[PDB]
Amino acid sequence: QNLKSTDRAVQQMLDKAKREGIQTVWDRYEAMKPQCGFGETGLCCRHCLQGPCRINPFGDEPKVGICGATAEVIVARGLDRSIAAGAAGHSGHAKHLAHTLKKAVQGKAASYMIKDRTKLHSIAKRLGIPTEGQKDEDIALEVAKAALADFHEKDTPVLWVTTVLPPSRVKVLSAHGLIPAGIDHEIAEIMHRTSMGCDADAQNLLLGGLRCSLADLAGCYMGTDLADILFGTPAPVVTESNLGVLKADAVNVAVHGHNPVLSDIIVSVSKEMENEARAAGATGINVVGICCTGNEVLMRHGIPACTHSVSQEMAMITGALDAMILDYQCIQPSVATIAECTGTTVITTMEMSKITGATHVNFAEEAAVENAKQILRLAIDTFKRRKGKPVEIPNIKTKVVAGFSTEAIINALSKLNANDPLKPLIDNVVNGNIRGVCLFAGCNNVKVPQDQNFTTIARKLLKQNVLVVATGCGAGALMRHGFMDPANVDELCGDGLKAVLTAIGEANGLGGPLPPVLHMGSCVDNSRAVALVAALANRLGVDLDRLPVVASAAESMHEKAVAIGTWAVTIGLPTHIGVLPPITGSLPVTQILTSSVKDITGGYFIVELDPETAADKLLAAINERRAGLGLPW
Amino acid sequence: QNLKSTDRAVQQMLDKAKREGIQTVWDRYEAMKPQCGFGETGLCCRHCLQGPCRINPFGDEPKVGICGATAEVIVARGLDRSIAAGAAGHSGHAKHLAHTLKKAVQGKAASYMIKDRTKLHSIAKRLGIPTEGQKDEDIALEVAKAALADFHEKDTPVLWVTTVLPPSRVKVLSAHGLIPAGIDHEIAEIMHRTSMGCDADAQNLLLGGLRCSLADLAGCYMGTDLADILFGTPAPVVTESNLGVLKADAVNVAVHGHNPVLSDIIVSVSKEMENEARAAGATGINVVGICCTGNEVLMRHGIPACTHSVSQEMAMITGALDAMILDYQCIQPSVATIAECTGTTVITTMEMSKITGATHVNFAEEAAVENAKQILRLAIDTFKRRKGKPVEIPNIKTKVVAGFSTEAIINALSKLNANDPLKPLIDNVVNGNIRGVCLFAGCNNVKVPQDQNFTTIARKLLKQNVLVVATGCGAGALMRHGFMDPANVDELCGDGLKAVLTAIGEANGLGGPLPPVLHMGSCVDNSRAVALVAALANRLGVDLDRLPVVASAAESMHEKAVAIGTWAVTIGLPTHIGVLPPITGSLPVTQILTSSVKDITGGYFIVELDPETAADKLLAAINERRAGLGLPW
Ligand code: SF4
Ligand code: SF4
Ligand code: FES
Ligand code: FES
């Protein structure tokens, strides 16, 4: 089970699933081998009914699509659609939050409100929305209207791109025509241009893809902005992670998905429901997190993270998961089937994300508390049905210090320099105590022993004094292996990095360092890392492609992660991907994405499936940036 | 060559391409056999990097996707993305026209103007835009703004759906939540909900698809509306079709693609350029049409149609095609490669549709006449390079009577009943002279001997007195085989249909009948058939799913045709498709699309690959509707 997951709690549940005959994601993967090499390489096209077309990577015919589409066209078109799908997910999430804020300040959903008034005003100012003499509800209405306006063409480009990157970076992108005109506009233009008999030039196709990835970035940043306004900006929190956060004697309720519009409500209402749970024989309601919705309520409320990504079925295999409350994205639909064996009540809540066999609750912001109570009462009913039964919760968990929003990081740094908070960070980059910054983002992927790439790469970078930040299930992987426990700083961090983490932590009164890795939140909260990197670029007076900052999607799977990797490249970062993307079927496409895009945006992809090698390549990229700034390395 | 195309001119060019060693679409098809059965059946998923996943249609594992996605989920998700891509193409076309109208009436592009003032006012009235006391330029500005507004969420649903279907049909659709909220909004929601770990219920997925297909219908209808305003509503015209419309001694210029924003300009400017062409040694400039842009200028100007769809390479094989001017959609990118052998200058004009090796001209409405002159001068240069050379233009063409916009059809009927023009049509439906109406739409497809399904089905329906209307390359197939020549009415039409066609034609002064098939225009002009069917429904006081009206996508290929077929089903029509769509891998999906959707919208798909059988099934569907209205059959 060690070849499936490096997580010991997951291994224990895989043994339980095996002896109970419950098929897992790893079993379904084994049943799929060998996988199709045309698809793996990207040399397959089904964009019209003359297809499917395939191209042999090497050898004899077929060498070209039926319509004449070349390998480079087919590969670039498929990649573009993946970027568009990723953009559609992040921006649907943001769109939902924009409508929630609008309803809240028009008096249509009293369960929602402006919780972070300071963030509201800063966003409005960044957007050019006047605040002086205005009511908060009017400013927020204007912010929500501006958010919804960025989805379509208008007098301005997408402001959640042009107002969040430095002017020098926006100029570079505008010169190549890469600034999105509208978020859903770009998604649709990708689907048009990649349909049959349309765009058939790999360079033109990929430039369209870069622009669509900036539409995804805008969705991410808008999602983070709006959730912070509605639910509060994260500040440092201490909690726990892994399956041992389930409690046999409590009603265990997992929030799972990405959009916390309901799950933030679930957290608040579950406290109100405690006595009702106690009357049922439980100690209380134990809300735990799965995937990015779990990250959202971990960041803001300290809700412990149960598990992530590829191993999400294992939470149910314990026998103690009374309910799993789903919104959308990255939910394995197997959970609906597994629930018949484990007793878990799986509940969908969003109209456009239903799973055959799961109970659906039609959540509406107008009825959010009432929906939450209906959902939690199903969970309490489920706990009663297992009162007495034996469960197997692995007694395995880690300590997690998290909640490092960019505002929180700036505040923490401000204890070392009040009026120039970025300077202590840059000082230590310059003097070598901090070699560079690496963002770990993205998913787990069944092809990769779970967490192996994230932890192998992270260990090597931390020893070389790289400041490591993490989001999504990359944060999940590192959190479950102790990388967010400050007690592991001595073991994990090089001397220079340790000195910096200790100095900042002691100055924030902690008596100990910051954790080895800074948890910056959910997948949309990759936008927080952009905010930090852009602030560093502005403070240094350089563009992002001169900073010693890299990204690693070390184990990625979702189309959303393809979009994020592409916009990391587009804003200027060396961007590692640790699984094979479907580009190896076209050498020209691969050369554009890993080499010649350097000449356009300054960023580039680093495809490397071996984690030790990937870490060396990421260190080389960081050290090249150091050399270009004239620094020692 | 008879197994490749039933078009004798295409057969002659296939012989020329064969002996000259020029690879064709049919050769590339042969090189692709056998095609992938997982893709053919829809049982393949590449929506995340854990893939590709496939499911054996029958037998042992794999039986399920790695994430747990079932065959029915995988099939429905792939279908939904095809609908979204189709919607993105038709609505990008419409969006382009909306921006062109806006620029024109704001004084930004003097080559464009309000040509059909009557259509402008009727559209405005249908939209609720006040016209009394308003300048035309202000009304048109309001119309263009309303068009662009339908792409995003707003206070109203998509008006190019809700204002173009009868209230009873809109009520049926609203009751099932099928009315689109915004065109690009729906496209993005499809891409989100079909991404990994999102919607996983086949019924929910397909209902989303029906709603997205209505977004495609809105794009089609908006495209037709705006092009009519800008370029004029079609009225009956006489021209010719097939390769024999090329002229060895003229500069032959093909307009190819879908959006006639530039090609309508090409038509006007080419007349201005005649003396320049003559000075080069040509008789003049011979503009001819390929695919739907050719249909647009055929409908409005009588430009002869050179060829269509699968056989588009053959126009170049003549040796006489000096230029091929491309916008986007359904252009085989092989043309850029074939051009190196044939001498043709292939020119792209749209930023998001480029082809490696083709010359690009950056068309802009602001510079439209100047761009047109640059393009035509490349064509004249190309004619000079072949002055003297031998060409092989098959001396094969047909007579084509076309231009039957819905306004033209109503006008023609008004000569038999001035104040109630639909009544003579309904009278003859009721008394049996017209058994029903069949719309032929969609593409050719290399899997089907070119035009075989369109003509086989059309012959059987016409003998049974069905009124046949046609668009796109279905109109192209029928036009090239003589179905738009009134001289073939006696041979092709049953006695009742002949009587009606003769009566209408004689009353319009023709001295002979209307043609056997009524050409209603381009693929977006499928919206014209909706306008006619909706007017018939309103006049009869029934919903569309009670009319004896059917549709046949007899040889379809493009994602656009998948979207059109789906919205034909969604507005209530029995809808035949004559190629295998990737749904046969899921019996539940197939049952929804061919049977249970009857209970939702009243329409349904008829999948039938054998054309004789398809015609019987379409006749049965028409006759069932007749019986439901109490009519003899
Ligand atoms: S678009 Fe071209 S390559 Fe793709 S399936 Fe159709 S014919 Fe084949
Ligand atoms: S979304 Fe599911 S079925 Fe599709 S490729 Fe990913 S794991 Fe396989
Ligand atoms: S041939 Fe396997 S992915 Fe298409
Ligand atoms: S396995 Fe052939 S289409 Fe994917």
- Three-class secondary structure assignment of A322-350: EEEEECCCCCCCHHHHHHHHHCCEEEECE
Angstrom distance (rounded) from CA A87 to CA A80: 11
CA A67–ligand 1 middle distance (angstroms) = 6
- As beta bridge partners, residue B13 has none
Token output for B586:
């899921």
B13 contact partners, CB below 8 Å, separation of at least 6: B243, B311, B314, B317, B318, B392, B394
* Side-chain-facing half-sphere of B279: CA atoms under 13 Å: 6
Is the separation of the CB atoms in A98 and A144 below 8 Å? yes
Give the Å distance between the CA of B52 and the centre of ligand 3.
Answer: 7
The angle formed by the CA atoms of residues A440, A442 and A447, to the nearest 5 degrees, is 110
Residue corresponding to tokens 């498929």: A78
Helix, strand, coil shares of chain A as percentages rounded to 5?
50, 10, 35
Q: Which residues of A touch B355 (CB under 8 A)?
A: 200-201
Ligand nearest to the CA of B53: 2
Give residues with Cβ within 8 angstroms of B134, minimum separation 6. Answer: none
With contacts defined as CB-CB under 8 Å, which chain A residues touch B91? 188
Query: Do residues B603 and B597 make contact, with C-beta atoms less than 8 angstroms apart?
Result: yes
> Within an 8 Å CB–CB cutoff, is residue A387 touching chain B?
no
Instruction: Provide the angle, in degrees to the nearest 10, between the axes of the packed helices A117-127 and A136-149.
Output: 50
Quick one: tokens of B623? 């006759």
Distance CA B522, CA B530 (A): 13
Residue whose C-alpha is closest to residue A440's, from A518, A534, A498: A518
A25 touches chain B (CB under 8 A): yes
**Distance (Å) from the alpha carbon of A170 to chain B's nearest alpha carbon:** 21
CA–CA distances in Å: residue A293 to residues A222, A244, A296, A403, B69: 16, 19, 5, 14, 21
Does ligand 3 lie within 6 Å of residue A52's CB atom? Answer: yes
**Residue A559 to residue B47, Cβ atoms within 8 A:** yes
Which of B32, B33, B38, B41 for a ligand 4 pocket mutation test, highest count of atoms within 8 Å of Cβ?
B38
φ, ψ for residue A191, nearest 5 deg: -65, -35
Question: Which tokens sit at B555?
Answer: 């040889």
Task: Compute how many other C-beta atoms are within 10 angstroms of the C-beta atom of residue B203.
Answer: 16
Spatial contact of B463 and B494, defined as CB atoms under 8 Å apart: yes
Which are the contacts of B370, defined by CB distance < 8 A and separation ≥ 6? none
Q: Which of A87, A57, A73 is nearest to A206 (CA)?
A: A73
Q: Is A597 helix (H, G, I), strand (E, B) or coil?
A: coil
HSE-CB at B293 with a 13 A cutoff on CA atoms is 29
Integer Cα distance of B590 and B337 in angstroms:
39
Nearest-CA residue of chain A relative to B61?
A: A31
User: SS3 for A625?
Assistant: helix
Which residue is associated with the tokens 């019996």? B587
Instruction: Decide whether any atom of ligand 2 lies within 6 Å of the B209 Cβ.
Output: no
Of A129, A303, A331, A145, the residue nearest A222 (C-alpha): A145
B451 three-state secondary structure: coil
Residues sharing a CB contact under 8 Å with residue A404, sequence separation 6 or more, in sequence order = A234, A236, A412, A469, A518, A519, A520, A521
For residue B575, give the H/E element and its range: strand B574-577
Alpha carbon of B204: minimum distance to chain A alpha carbons (Å): 7
Cis peptide before A611 (omega within 30 of 0): no
| The two structure tokens encoding residue A342 | 């484990």
Note whether B31 contacts A: Cβ–Cβ < 8 A. yes
Q: Is B38 in the pocket of ligand 4 (CB under 6 A)?
A: yes
Rounded-to-integer distance, Cα A226 and Cα A451, Å: 30
Most B CBs within 10 A among A27, A45, A48, hence the mutation to make, goes to A48
Q: Please name the residues in contact with A383: beta carbons below 8 A apart, sequence gap of 6 or more.
A: A250, A251, A252, A277, A280, A281, A282, A322
Q: What is the DSSP string of B400-448?
A: EEE---HHHHHHHHHTT-SS-THHHHHHHHHHTSS-EEEEE-S---TTS
**Dihedral, CA of residue A186, residue A187, residue A189 and residue A195, to nearest 10:** 160
Q: Give one word for B528, left, alpha or beta, with left for phi > 0 and alpha for psi -120 to 50.
A: alpha
In contact, B41 and B57? CB cutoff 8 Å: yes
In this structure, chain A runs to a length of 633
Q: What is the DSSP letter of B487?
A: G
In b/e form, how buried is each residue of A450-475, taking b as 16+ CB within 10 angstroms? bbbbbbbbbbbbbebbbbbbbbbbbb
Judging contacts by C-beta atoms under 8 Å, the chain B residues touching residue A557 are 48-50, 196
Amino acid at A30: E
Q: Is A362 in the pocket of ligand 1 (CB under 6 A)?
A: no
Instruction: State which residue of chain A sits closest to B291, comparing Cα positions.
Output: A197
Q: Does A556 touch chain B (CB under 8 A)?
A: yes
- Reduce the DSSP state of residue A558 to 3 states and report it: strand
Choose among A627, A629, A623, A574: nearest CA to A603: A574
Q: B101 with B92: CB under 8 angstroms? A: no
> A with B: how many residue pairs have Cβ under 8 Å apart?
320
Give B15's contacts (C-beta < 8 A, 6+ positions apart). Answer: B1
Q: Are B489 and B465 in contact (CB under 8 A)?
A: no
Under 8 Å CB-to-CB from A192, ≥6 apart: which residues? A198, B85, B88, B89, B92, B328, B352
**How far is it, in rounded angstroms, from Cα A284 to Cα A262?**
20
CA distance B278 to B257: 27
How far is it, in rounded angstroms, from Cα A48 to Cα B481?
25
Contacts of A473 (CB under 8 A, 6+ apart): A291, A292, A308, A309, A442, A443, A444, A555
- For B355, which of A201, A351, A560 is closest by C-beta distance? A201
Cis peptide before B515 (omega within 30 of 0): no
Contact A383, A251 (CB under 8 A): yes
- Record the tokens describing residue B15, joined without a space: 């012989």
Name the 3-class secondary structure at A391.
coil
Inter-helix orientation angle B495-507/B422-431, to 10°: 160
Directed axis angle between helix A452-463 and helix A472-480, to 10°? Answer: 80
Dihedral sign of CA atoms B458, B461, B464, B467 in order: negative
Gap from A424 CA to chain B (nearest CA, Å): 40
CB contact under 8 A, B46 and A39: yes
Q: What is the DSSP pairing of strand A574-577 with strand A549-553?
A: parallel
Please give the Cα distance from B317 to B336 (Å, whole number). 13
Burial class (CB in 10 A: 0-12, 13-18, 19+), B59: exposed
A54–B73 CB contact, under 8 Å: no
CB B83 within 8 A of CB B212: yes
How many angstroms does the Cα of residue A21 sit away from the middle of ligand 1?
42
Decide: A395 in ligand 1 pocket, CB within 6 A.
Answer: no
- Single-letter amino acid code for the residue at B35: Q
* Cβ-based neighbour number of residue B364 at 10 Å: 14
Provide the token pair at B202: 């086949």
Number of residues that this document lists for chain B: 633
Whether residue B37 has its Cβ less than 6 Å from ligand 4: no
Q: How far apart are CA A535 and CA A518, in angstroms?
A: 17
Strand A466-471 with A517-521, pairing: parallel
What is the structure's resolution, reported in angstroms to one decimal?
1.8
Spacing of C-alpha B260 from chain mean position = 13
Q: Is B362 on the interface with A (CB under 8 A)?
A: no
Is the beta carbon of A557 within 6 A of some atom in ligand 1? no
β-sheet bridge partners, residue A512: none
Q: How far is CA B628 from the centre of its chain?
A: 30
Q: Do B54 and A36 touch (CB under 8 A)?
A: yes
What are the phi and psi torsion angles at B252 (to 5°)? Answer: -95, 120
Would you list the domain boundaries of chain B? 60-234, 235-403, 406-633
B568 backbone dihedrals φ, ψ, rounded to 5° = -60, -40
Helix, strand and coil in chain B, % to nearest 5: 50, 10, 35
CA B64/CA B75 separation, integer angstroms: 12
- Chain B partners of A63 at a C-beta cutoff of 8 Å? 31
CA distances from A324 to A282, A287, A353, B26 (A): 17, 10, 14, 52
Q: Which residue among B28, B49, B188 places its CB closest to the CB of A184?
A: B188
Q: Locate tokens 């936008």: which residue?
A: A527
Distance between CA atoms of B579 and B577, rounded to whole angstroms? 6
Q: Rounded to 5 degrees, what are φ and ψ at A146?
A: -65, -40
**Cβ pair B48, A25 in contact under 8 A:** no
- Is the Cβ of A609 closer than 8 Å to some Cβ of chain B? no
* A259 touches A326 (CB < 8 A): no
Those residues whose C-beta lies under 8 Å from the C-beta of residue B598, and which sit 6 or more positions away, are B604
E strand intervals along B173-327 = 237-241, 251-257, 285-290, 305-307, 321-326
H/E stretch holding B617: helix B611-628
Which candidate, A248, A241, A285, places its Cα nearest to that of A266?
Answer: A285
Cβ contacts (< 8 Å) between B65 and chain A: which residues? 28
Q: In what order do the strands lie in the sheet with B574-577?
A: B517-521, B466-471, B436-440, B549-553, B574-577, B604-607
Residue B45 near ligand 2, beta carbon < 6 Å: yes
